[PDB]
Amino acid sequence: TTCCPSIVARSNFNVCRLPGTSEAICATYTGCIIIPGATCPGDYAN
């Protein structure tokens, strides 16, 4: 599951994913995070 800190970060993440870039690389690129659960925390609300 991916969780993003802000709207901008999520939008950036989605563009990063368009060529098929691994989630983990898009995460460090944007500040989004990958978690094993389905429940994003309040400080990664987007």
UniProtKB/Swiss-Prot annotation:
Disulfide-bond pairs as recorded: 3-40, 4-32, 16-26
- Fill in the misc note: Two isoforms exists, a major form PL (shown here) and a minor form SI.
* Organism, scientific name: Crambe hispanica subsp. abyssinica
Where found in the cell?
Secreted
Instruction: Give the protein name, as stated in the record.
Output: Crambin
- What does the similarity note say? Belongs to the plant thionin (TC 1.C.44) family.
State any GO BP term from the record: defense response
According to its UniProt entry, the function of this protein is described as:
The function of this hydrophobic plant seed protein is not known.
What keywords tag this UniProt record? Disulfide bond, Plant defense, Secreted
The answer on whether this UniProt entry bears the keyword Secreted reads yes
Task: Output the Pfam families linked to this UniProt entry.
Answer: Thionin
Q: Which SUPFAM superfamilies match?
A: Crambin-like (SSF57429)
GO cellular component annotations, sorted alphabetically?
Answer: extracellular region
The answer on whether this UniProt entry bears the keyword Secreted reads yes
